[PDB]
């Protein structure tokens, strides 16, 4: 909603300051399980996978 | 048919049963949580090789031969 545009910008860099973004976030999603017998012992690791 | 094979062994080595062997079976576990992959291969066993068949291909014993026309002397 700010940024008056104009020419004379030339990089997409330079006025990136003004862009609409996520601000990030973070979810659960949680409760997981358990493999073999025990629970403390698992791990988690998100990816793109 | 059987008897005529020569003596054949497959090339890698391959599990077999046994009284004597390195390989412990395990007879039972944890399989505590059935959620882990369950393979289980089968029995011990004979491993039949083309089995499909019996009637093999038969390779002709016929050798080079022109069919050559015989009428022959009654005298």
């Given at each position: 909603?700010?940024?008056?545009?104009?020419?004379?910008?030339?990089?997409?860099?330079?006025?990136?300051?003004?862009?609409?973004?996520?601000?990030?976030?973070?979810?659960?999603?949680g409760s997981i399980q358990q493999v073999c017998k025990d629970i403390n012992r698992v791990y988690l690791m998100?990816?793109?996978? | 048919?059987?008897?005529?094979?020569?003596?054949?062994?497959?090339?890698?080595?391959?599990?077999?049963?046994?009284?004597?062997?390195?390989?412990?079976?395990?007879?039972?576990?944890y399989?505590p949580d059935?959620s882990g992959?369950?393979?289980?291969?089968?029995?011990?066993?004979?491993?039949?090789?083309?089995?499909?068949?019996?009637?093999?291909?038969?390779?002709?014993?016929?050798?080079?031969?022109?069919?050559?026309?015989?009428?022959?002397?009654?005298?």
């Open positions: 909603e700010s940024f008056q545009f104009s020419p004379s910008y030339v990089d997409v860099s330079s006025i990136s300051n003004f862009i609409i973004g996520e601000n990030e976030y973070h979810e659960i999603q998100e990816s793109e996978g | 048919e059987n008897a005529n094979l020569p003596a054949t062994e497959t090339d890698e080595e391959v599990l077999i049963v046994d009284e004597n062997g390195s390989v412990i079976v395990g007879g039972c576990q399989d059935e992959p369950i393979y289980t291969k089968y029995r011990e066993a004979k491993a039949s090789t083309n089995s499909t068949h019996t009637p093999p291909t038969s390779i002709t014993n016929i050798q080079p031969y022109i069919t050559v026309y015989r009428w022959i002397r009654i005298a």
